[PDB]
Paper text:
The p53 tumor suppressor is a pioneer transcription factor, and binds to the nucleosomal p53BS DNA when it is located near the nucleosomal edge. The basic chromatin unit is a nucleosome, in which approximately 150 base pairs (bps) of DNA are bound to a histone octamer containing two each of histones H2A, H2B, H3, and H4 (5).
We purified the p53 DBD peptide (residues 94 to 293) as a recombinant protein, and incubated it with the reconstituted nucleosome. The 20 bp p53BS DNA is composed of a tandem repeat of the palindromic 5’ GGGCA TGCCC 3’ 10-mer, and each p53 DBD protomer specifically recognizes a 5’ GGGCA 3’ sequence. To accomplish the specific DNA binding in the nucleosome, the p53 DBD tetramer peels 15 bp of the nucleosomal DNA from the histone surface at the entry/exit region, and the p53 DBD binds the p53BS DNA site. Consequently, the linker DNA path of the p53BS is bent by about 40 degrees upon p53 binding. The nucleosomal linker DNA re-orientation observed in the p53-bound state could be induced with the p53 DBD lacking the N- and C-terminal regions, indicating that the p53 DBD alone is sufficient for the specific DNA binding in the nucleosome.
Author numbering:
A (entry chain G): 13 to 118
B (entry chain L), F (entry chain M), K (entry chain K), L (entry chain N): 94 to 291
C (entry chain A): 38 to 134
D (entry chain H): 28 to 122
E (entry chain B): 21 to 102
G (entry chain E): 37 to 134
H (entry chain F): 23 to 102
I (entry chain C): 11 to 119
DNA sequence: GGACATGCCCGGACATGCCCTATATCTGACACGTGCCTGGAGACTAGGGAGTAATCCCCTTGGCGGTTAAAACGCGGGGGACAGCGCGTACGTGCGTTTAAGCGGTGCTAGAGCTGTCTACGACCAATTGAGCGGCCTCGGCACCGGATTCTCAGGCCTGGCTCGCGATAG
DNA sequence: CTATCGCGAGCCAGGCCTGAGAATCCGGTGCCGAGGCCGCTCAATTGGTCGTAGACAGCTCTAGCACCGCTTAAACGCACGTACGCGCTGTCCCCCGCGTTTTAACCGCCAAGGGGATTACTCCCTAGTCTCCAGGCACGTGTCAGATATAGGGCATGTCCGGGCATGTCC
């Protein structure tokens, strides 16, 4: 029987795949055993946060399936995610429904 | 009037008879006929169907005339006409003179006569044979005052006399029925029928 | 007959197109422009469908963002109408001009 | 039969963990894959540069942790470091 | 050889782009500047894309070439490959 | 009108009969026919299929005409037409005059007549023998006012008279059916069928 | 009466003077005290190399000069001359720092 | 503390002059101070992070050079 | 044994081919590096150095200075459209800025 | 005697003497030149590595370097650099 | 009418009041007054005594005028007049125009006015101080239609306005009362009084 | 219309207010007002009394105008007028144009205006103070279509705007109320009041 | 006068409008299953990179003093920010026309992509040595300074020209 | 007495000259950092070997291009009205510029210590290889969800009429 490092760690992203991608990315001649575990774990965390917010936005929109619009809403409405993705354009995301106050009628 | 129109039933050569619908005695039925009384009870200005039955078809040019007279002998010489109020009100159908009691509805060829010698009013239409696949011809009369109209019929009963005439006015046949024009034909018909037993 | 006040339909269109996600530039003229510019860089180029869609998504995002910044600069000057000088200021401050 | 590389099954498991009632479209899946690959490249590159600058030839967890602290915002960095440390400690105990 | 395709970027398209950007009113003089800006963008992006294509010994610009060009210009685009 | 069109059934030399679809009496029914009443119940401006059946094929040039008349005898002389509201609304199909109650849909060779002598409206199309697969030719009528339209049919029942005619409008056959144009054909059909037992 | 230049002549003179030269314009020691103060809010008892503070100071002055260039361009765009906080906020918003 | 006042009014005026402005509103100075302070928070954060990763107790010029480079503005003249 | 001569001399360049090659090998860029890559890289670096130094020298003589200072380097970089583009996001220490006054700020008669 | 610290100072001086025989260099300016050369080095080597990776190439050649130079350098600068590199590489290969 | 006559009670300088007899309510009574309703109930053409009371004697040439108006506000502008029937019947007393509702009986000096500007009818007599030994002057009015006459008052209640006026027609005093002209004054008075409790 | 008349309540200098009768909600009461809804419910062509109250008397020459508008904002610019059927029927009182929804009954001095600029219909009469005893002036309106008339109000609610104007037509005061013209005012009033709780 | 005679009004209730919702069917786009194969997991090996400890020195921190240039503060004023107003013109909105964008089907061939082979080419390793860096010394860039010379721009005064007012002469 | 013309005086504008600040130039000393030279050392060069990777050939088969046809929605041209950009004007306030006081920044000089860089020893941690196996990724079969339209189902609200009241009539 073979049991994987992700299974021993209780995580969802594959330790082996992240490890291989680090080994083949021409980044360093050696890679420690804990580095791909840490990296994979951070990726789960960030994915869970983004999917959490996108799901919330979908439910607010009475949608059961997340669409790119919901991803854009999630990234732009969250202050820290928008900072992290400040220079990132999501396709079919649109923009936030933001109107300047001076442009509203009197 | 100088005269009184005959009211004698005369079926004549063509076997001329009248027929009427079987309408019941609902308090305010628009028009109901009493076989017991030979009397039509109807509302003012409402449709009153009268059927013309013949054993054989009269010649083309045959006309059908209707005339009212008072039924009581002492009133017989008085011309039956509309009261002053209804005469003046604005209800003419564009065809009938305002003072005529009896109108025919739905017939462009209707003529209204004011007899120069007798002073009687009458309304005449061409006789139309029933479709060869039919039994009778129906004429639709309207009575334009209530029997009770003051200054008019003033609660005196009338007869309607229906005459079958040739082109010239020659008597081919005659029939008649009593008429009460009233607000509640069914009520009044039942009352008079009950009173027959009294 | 009936006539809408200046400004209501503009705002309605803004809300309409910011609520939805369909592309606003026509496919065929964009492709034609891209191909025209390309002839002067390399001859007889072929372009993938997803490549033209990529250029169009990038272009529309860039122009929408530039128009956002232009609008902010115009409103800053107590104006509503965008001017060429507004575009030039936005691009200069962004650091590409 | 040209094998490719995507995180589709793992993204779907995490989604089912956080929301086991929501699906995802192809365009949205493409956006998630682009996002994860971009993050990966950014973090791995910063960790690589960190290691080179410090004359380190091995990729270890301390450079990964520092790179995460540099790239992620405040609360995101703190929560990511906490989850990474707990997970690495549990794995190390589990061997 | 395609000629005068710049006129295909119509006035209402630029107006729609401005609406999505939050612009309420657009001067008639806006359009030529916008067209120039668009053209500039294209000459830079396409130059990088074609450069990559030629290095790869290809004659067809691929989606990955464009996405990579955009990334190396800081305008990274999601949805066409990572 | 000066006259009333005959309504007598006449199958004639060609054995002309009408047929109708078997639509039930439900809600959302746009056209349903009652064999018990020989009456079509249909919605305004909805398709009303009427089948023409013949024992033998009439000559080329034979036409099919439809005309409405009021069913009640006292209204028979009144031309059936659209009410003032529908007459004015903008629903003409480019072929039918605005005041015609009865239209034929899907026939470029349709003619609408306003009879100079009788003042009757009618709609006529060329007779075409049945299509391969059918023993009848179907014509699709539209009725453009509800029976209840005030100023129009005003709740009076009508008959549709379908005549098979020659080029010179001579009579080859005639059939007819009652029509109620209404919002709920199924409801109203069941009501009138129930009332037959009352 | 003593001599006095009209508003602006002396402003332009200092502009020319400070744009011709490269010597630092912000005081070393107060900036140094600020940097150490701000730093203890991240890590206590931190030390600084001299060349580290000089690097931070060079970076700060270059950043401020560029920001003031952009602010001036935005002010001139609005047919104004005197810069105000909303000008700074517009310049930083358009740059993508906000 | 009070040390933010050590970047004095004439210092902000001089920096603004090198930025080419002719007139400076009274409300400018606090705004400039805030902007400068935020910049410092971000730079010093990155610098100290680098210093701690190297297991050092003193922030070096090279730490600052890396912080500035990663902030998106490369500084020449201090090594690297 | 043949007399030792360097690849930079063989290529007519001044930058060290050996050192650039070593830095490419040890920069964790790839496991394998061709012989011509460091030659090409050295040539591009030498070219850019020669143009920047040329312009800085021009500026220095325009200022009647014989020694290149950072100010001259900054002036040279900013006065060249292509160098300014290449170094758009670079700040030169002790470089100052280009002398430039917007027309609206100048006095009027 | 401190540790071996590499720099381009002597090479910058040799090029300077080629282009300006009677011009010197200050230490601050030489430091700026070293920063510049190292920055360009990092940009070109990194872009070439990325280019090679993108194309599943395991060897660093001259084509990726030249293409990277063309991407990073402006038009006429790129043409002159490419011309110089090709002449230099062909002359080296002749040896 | 272009106007409505004022109905405000105004006793004026001479202390002008009305009085009425104490007639009871036998259903057949010809004229009976209800103090509870300030309403006269009277039969058509029957004598209706109205007493004029004054505290002091108005000058010679003083006249007394009576006019009817509809009591309900929406009918106030409609001139009160006889119905078409009673207008035409032959009951004029030689003094009163046929269309005037209100007459005065037993006074040769009565005048009937048809106002050229207001179109109102009225009847006027000279005021006479009471006969020696009397405390009031009685005027005898006749009402010449029933309140129910169709084409006339048509079941609408009226007021009678009695005015004391000088020789130029200027107002000296005014009083009024409601009137119902009906077949059974006593019956109808008791009915309306009973309904006060309802 | 190019414009919409203001509906803002404005009692003005004369303290102008409206009042209404206390009619209950019997199924078919002719006209009944709902204080809860500020809405009149009335039958077609029936009398609708509206009381004008003022704190002090406006000058001679003052006029009272009534105009209908649609209550729903999207219909406000559409001129309220009679439906094609009632427009054509023969019910004009000799004073009102056939297309005007709102008439005044019993006033010879009524004027009907068809505004050349706004295209709005209105009906205006001279203001008349009450007699010094009385406390208000009543005007009687007739509404000449049902709210439901197709091609007319087509089931859209309307407001009646009552304005007090000087002799030049300048504004002195304004009030308004909602109107439903319907067959069963009492039924419909109770239904809408009940729905207030829903 | 009581008992009917006879019309009118309207609440009951049906006729028959219209929307209102719910269920079923059809169309479109998407979760999960399967087989395989190749990339990940367990095990063993070497070796070298990293952890740790001692050392040294340099370079960072802290203090004292002066002194002077810069920062802080007061105050006058002028010019620039800003609010208000008028206008005219350029842009928003709507409508009829036309134009081409979009969609669906179909072809074919160019070219992306995969596989096989092999040879050129780059990693690796040992010996050499000469290029490059640290340290020391010196002289010239050149600034740093200060003081006289040169000088452009601004302000003030004087002169000339034009306009207005007053007086004189002529009609 | 009034009007017109001429002369004189006053005011405004333009030009020229003088003053004054700022810059240029000249010399001087001097200083300290850049350039050069020399020892050394370690990193590049050269020569040889070996694995491997990518250059080229060749085959497949995907998708990009080209075209035709139909539709219809978007673009376009124009008419028109009006809201906003822009120019102008007035006001007042608040920032500049300069004089005076203060203070703390800087330069120099010295002391200490602590931590950063260096070297040496060790050990354990990860690449490399092998063997195996299971997870992940093309291919695929049907199914599930949403929208739309048809069946119940409510209200939405007019017309007719039986009942019951109103009111005339008379032996």
């Amino acid at each position: 029987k073979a049991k994987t490092r992700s299974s021993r760690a209780g995580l969802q992203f594959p330790v082996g795949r992240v490890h291989r991608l680090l080994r083949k990315g021409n980044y360093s001649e050696r890679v420690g055993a804990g580095a791909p575990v840490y990296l994979a774990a951070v990726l789960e965390y960030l994915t869970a946060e983004i999917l959490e917010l996108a799901g919330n936005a979908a439910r607010d929109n009475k949608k059961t399936r997340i669409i790119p619009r919901h991803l854009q809403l999630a990234i732009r409405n969250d202050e820290e995610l928008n900072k992290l993705l400040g220079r990132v354009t999501i396709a079919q995301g649109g923009v936030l429904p933001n109107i300047q106050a001076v442009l509203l009628p009197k | 009037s100088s005269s009184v129109p005959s009211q004698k039933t005369y079926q004549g050569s063509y076997g001329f008879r009248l027929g009427f619908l079987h309408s019941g005695t609902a308090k305010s039925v628009t028009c109901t006929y009493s076989p017991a009384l030979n009397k039509m009870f109807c509302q003012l200005a409402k449709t009153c169907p009268v059927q013309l039955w013949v054993d054989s078809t009269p010649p083309p040019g045959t006309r059908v005339r209707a005339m009212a007279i008072y039924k009581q002998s002492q009133h017989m010489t008085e011309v039956v006409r509309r009261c002053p109020h209804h005469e003046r009100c604005s209800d003419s159908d564009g065809l009938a003179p305002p003072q005529h009691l009896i109108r025919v509805e739905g017939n462009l060829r209707v003529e209204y006569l004011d007899d120069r010698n007798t002073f009687r009013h009458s309304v005449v239409v061409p006789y139309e044979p029933p479709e060869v696949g039919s039994d009778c011809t129906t004429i639709h009369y309207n009575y334009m005052c209530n029997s009770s109209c003051m200054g008019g019929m003033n609660r005196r009963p009338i007869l309607t006399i229906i005459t079958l005439e040739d082109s010239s006015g020659n008597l081919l046949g005659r029939n008649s029925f009593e008429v009460r024009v009233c607000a509640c034909p069914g009520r009044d018909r039942r009352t008079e029928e009950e009173n027959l037993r009294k | 007959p009936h006539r809408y006040r200046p400004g209501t339909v503009a705002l309605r269109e803004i809300r309409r197109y910011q609520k939805s996600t369909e592309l606003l530039i026509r496919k065929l003229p964009f492709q034609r422009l891209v191909r025209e510019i390309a002839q002067d860089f390399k001859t007889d180029l072929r372009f993938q469908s997803s490549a033209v869609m990529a250029l169009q998504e990038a272009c529309e995002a860039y122009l929408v963002g530039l128009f956002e910044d232009t609008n902010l600069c115009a409103i800053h000057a107590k104006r509503v109408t965008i001017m060429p000088k507004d575009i030039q200021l936005a691009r200069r401050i962004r650091g590409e001009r | 039969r040209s094998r490719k590389e995507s995180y589709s099954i793992y993204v779907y498991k995490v989604l089912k963990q956080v929301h086991p009632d929501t699906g995802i479209s192809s365009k949205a899946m493409g956006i998630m894959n682009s996002f994860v690959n971009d993050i990966f490249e950014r973090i791995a590159g910063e960790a690589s540069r960190l290691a080179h600058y410090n004359k380190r030839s091995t990729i270890t967890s301390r450079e990964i942790q520092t790179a995460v602290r540099l790239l992620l915002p405040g609360e995101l960095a703190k929560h990511a470091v906490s989850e990474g440390t707990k997970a690495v400690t549990k794995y190390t105990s589990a061997k | 050889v395609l000629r005068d395709n710049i006129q295909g970027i119509t006035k209402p398209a630029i107006r729609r782009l401005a609406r999505r950007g939050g612009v309420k009113r657009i001067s008639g003089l806006i359009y030529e500047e916008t067209r120039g800006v668009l053209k500039v963008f294209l000459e830079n992006v396409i130059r990088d894309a074609v450069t990559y294509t030629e290095h790869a010994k290809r004659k067809t610009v691929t989606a990955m070439d464009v996405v990579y060009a955009l990334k190396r210009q800081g305008r990274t685009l999601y949805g066409f490959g990572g």
